[PDB]
Write a protein that binds this ligand. Structure first.
Ligand SMILES: COc1cc2c(cc1OC)[C@@H]1Cc3ccc(OC)c(OC)c3C[N@+]1(C)CC2
Ligand SMILES: COc1cc2c(cc1OC)[C@@H]1Cc3ccc(OC)c(OC)c3C[N@+]1(C)CC2
Ligand SMILES: Nc1ncnc2c1ncn2[C@@H]1O[C@H](CSCC[C@H](N)C(=O)O)[C@@H](O)[C@H]1O
Ligand SMILES: Nc1ncnc2c1ncn2[C@@H]1O[C@H](CSCC[C@H](N)C(=O)O)[C@@H](O)[C@H]1O
Lengths: 339, 339
């Protein structure tokens, strides 16, 4: 029986081949499926409702250089599941296709005020601003680096209809309302979902729509964390308490302040193809990445550490989202109006 | 290839043995499962949401003698799924166990005002009234015979806290509010669910709870009707447009006016054991039943017809609810508060 430290050591030293790494991670996810699936729908619902009840009771300086993100991710540095029509769809095309899918499903129209919560590097903000010149598009992020990157891109693209709010969304106070609120793979990070949804509703009028996209499991919810002491992966990728994977249906139970209008899922192979593209691009640009990171990180060892973390995230994400041809973990999307 | 009329003829003449009848009905339900299950969760949700959207767009003198109902059903003439703890649980015990389950899940407490919508022969009304003497319990039914039966039973049981409203619930207008509203296997008959839920909410205060129990399929919704021309069963049991079988999750999408607090399902073997008990009791009391019905129906042929209808309902219900050990069709229950 090998220890966590032992596996972690080989991992950090690049001694685990891709085939073995994939196999180890796939077995960890396998155990999560065993944990989450119950024998009867009666038991499945009891389990799911206990999770949802638990949620309702629940009341940092280092950032990657932009050149590094540019070398690993797609053109707009989307950090969320993309959408791949064809076998030959590139990550750049898949980003744009995802942006268009969100615009369709969130019913974006020219002239609307749009808020994007947890806007990342602002791919969606910039997409909407460029496509709908009479929209005013606000991104909200807790990262100064992200804000600065978005404002620079808007300037380069001659977009005059973009602003960015620098704020922790859980603390942000405002009387401003928006026609459209978008939340793309941000809710997974929210500690208090009920409060979050209530806050969003106060930023809506009776004409507004709220669109949420979140990674999910089709059947059950779980915190992203180790089940047992054999799981070296989960806590390596994310600290405890950071990420929650809701079931595809979980948000249906959070309609205190908003009302569902539509509900979709996107098969997990799209996410799998996304992380695969990132991993391959990082691999191709490995030497450049190491060069970019070295100044800010201080040693080749610290560099190798950051790279190992990102690359393993991609390798593991591949196994998670591709499990059973995309029919386990996937992406859920929901459209809401205000009550 | 045999016609519907041909199968119907043999059925009415008692020429189809139980084994063949069961097999024919089980194959009809099998085809419904093929119709309702989709290959991917993406497709399953598209199918389910299309059904729920369809619902949101949607805007007689003959009654069985009480002696007949008494000879076929359990002691309180419950016409809904019962709950069987043991292999030897009788239908009378299973009725009482169901009543207690509803009281627990609907959080009934002494002193509350309670409304039971579509109260049937009033088993639940009488149970609550007897167990909680400071509750005032109102049943609502569209049947004069049911109203009369309940009032007679309340008089015999020395219950002074029961009233019955004779009304079509879809037309009933009142400013009265109730602490608890119960809807046991009535919503399956409602043509406009959104309007129904909205009306119920107007009969609630901020302190009220609404408990709904409905037959369901765990995965998909369907109208109860023939898929094809080979289905002689569905339209024999119920006229087109009469009964809707919602998925176990369907009502989650109907929270415009109420908000979910809890959600359960009860495995289908409970319903199966219920209809099995009714069928066996009817069979045992067959000669008596024929005697009771003859005056009101006018001929042995009309009698045989009514009996065949009820008995086939039970035989078919057995195959439906027992399918895959109760893990296809079953009973859903939900608890709501008002928005
Ligand atoms: C459980 O695994 C997942 C976790 C989650 C995510 C994806 C996951 O697997 C593919 C998403 C998308 C994602 C993509 C690139 C990044 O890498 C730098 C990310 O980090 C900022 C994220 C973080 N998000 C938005 C939340 C958690
Ligand atoms: C699709 O099949 C079902 C249909 C439904 C029901 C049960 C079903 O199968 C077991 C329920 C329960 C039931 C029990 C005894 C009766 O028989 C005389 C009934 O009729 C008044 C009903 C009608 N309910 C309440 C609605 C439709
Ligand atoms: N409490 C909080 N307040 C504001 N932004 C937050 C936040 N917690 C996380 N975030 C932001 O939420 C985003 C999550 S990653 C998704 C980014 C973007 N929606 C995309 O699709 O690429 C990041 O921008 C992160 O900085
Ligand atoms: N529009 C309507 N208004 C009022 N009652 C209705 C109705 N449509 C159906 N009903 C009643 O709803 C009931 C459905 S059967 C279930 C009866 C009872 N809840 C039990 O569990 O035994 C019957 O009482 C039927 O008469």
């Amino acid at each position: 029986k090998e220890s966590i430290g032992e596996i972690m050591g080989k991992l950090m030293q690049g001694e685990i081949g891709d085939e073995e790494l994939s196999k180890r991670i796939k077995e960890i996810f396998g155990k999560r499926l065993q944990w989450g699936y119950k024998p009867t729908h009666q038991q499945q619902l009891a389990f799911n409702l206990d999770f949802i009840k638990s949620l309702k009771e629940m009341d940092e300086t280092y950032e990657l250089p932009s050149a590094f993100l540019e070398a690993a991710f797609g053109k707009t540095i989307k950090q969320s599941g993309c959408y791949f029509k064809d076998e030959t769809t590139t990550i750049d095309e898949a980003e744009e296709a995802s942006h268009e899918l969100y615009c369709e499903r969130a019913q974006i129209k020219d002239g609307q005020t749009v808020l994007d919560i947890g806007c990342g590097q602002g791919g969606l903000v910039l997409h909407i601003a460029q496509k709908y010149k009479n929209c005013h598009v606000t991104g909200l992020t807790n990262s100064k680096a992200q804000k600065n990157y978005i404002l620079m891109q808007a300037e380069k693209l001659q977009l005059s209809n973009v602003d960015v709010i620098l704020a922790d969304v859980t603390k942000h106070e405002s009387d401003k309302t928006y026609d459209r609120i978008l939340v793309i793979e941000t809710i997974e990070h929210m500690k208090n979902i009920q409060l979050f949804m209530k806050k969003l509703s106060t930023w809506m009028t009776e004409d507004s729509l709220l669109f949420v996209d979140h990674i999910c499991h089709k059947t059950f919810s779980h915190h992203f964390e180790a089940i047992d002491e054999d799981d070296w992966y989960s806590g390596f990728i994310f600290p405890k308490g950071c990420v929650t994977i809701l079931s595809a249906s979980a948000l249906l139970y959070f309609q205190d302040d908003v009302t569902i209008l539509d509900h979709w899922v996107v098969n997990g192979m799209h996410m799998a193809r996304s992380v695969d593209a990132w991993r391959k691009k990082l691999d191709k640009n490995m030497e450049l990445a190491r060069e970019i990171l070295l100044p800010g990180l201080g040693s080749k060892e610290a560099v190798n550490g950051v790279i190992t973390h990102i690359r393993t995230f991609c390798m593991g994400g591949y196994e998670q989202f591709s499990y059973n041809n995309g029919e386990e973990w996937m992406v859920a999307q929901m459209l809401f109006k205000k009550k």
